User: What shape does this take?
Amino acid sequence: GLRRAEQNTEDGMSLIQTAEGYLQETHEIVQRVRVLAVQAANGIYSEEDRQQIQVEVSQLVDEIDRIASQAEFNKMKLLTGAFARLNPTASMWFHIGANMHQRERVYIETMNT
Amino acid sequence: VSQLVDEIDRIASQAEFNKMKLLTGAFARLNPTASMWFHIGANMHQRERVYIETMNTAALGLRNPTVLTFISLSTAGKANSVIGLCDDALRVISKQRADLGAYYNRMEHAAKG
Assistant: This one.
């Protein structure tokens, strides 16, 4: 059980390590919107140019949604809000012990736009 | 101008990727003859669609979509009128390249996660 408890603990971290890997791509997108918002906020552009800026954001706005819906570890949805705290549709418990209740619970909030 | 306009038409009809035309209007949104989806997931419905508008002299407004007459600079008065159309035409190409690059960044991020 302790040998079993150890093997689960690595698997628990692998799930945790992956969701943070998906959040890495999400964070780089939001900054890219942020810098484009600075250029878009300058006063020397017209409606046409800022619309071209809005073109790239809408592609990026959807790409954040794509990561949120398609983020999976072992066929499990992670960033869609299942493992949240307020209204959870599932509970994630990592069993790091050799006995009945030797487990700890994990929370992941919604990560869509 | 005829030599220039002719080359624009040769561009759209001969622009190919993997023996598939792109600029002809095959993958547009309104009335497409085909849809372009990129498979970017580990599951079935993890895919995204690409829209490429038509980019010939007809779709740019520099050619009549019905009679197929293109712009003429033979008269000074008409030249002042072609200027407004080139403003109209370049906005569409600028709109489309901003479209593709928005997708291009979307894919470049997608590979990272």
Observations:
- The first strand of chain A starts at residue 72 and ends at 73.
- The two ends of chain A are 41 Å apart (CA to CA).
- Helices of chain A lie at 2-40, 47-70.
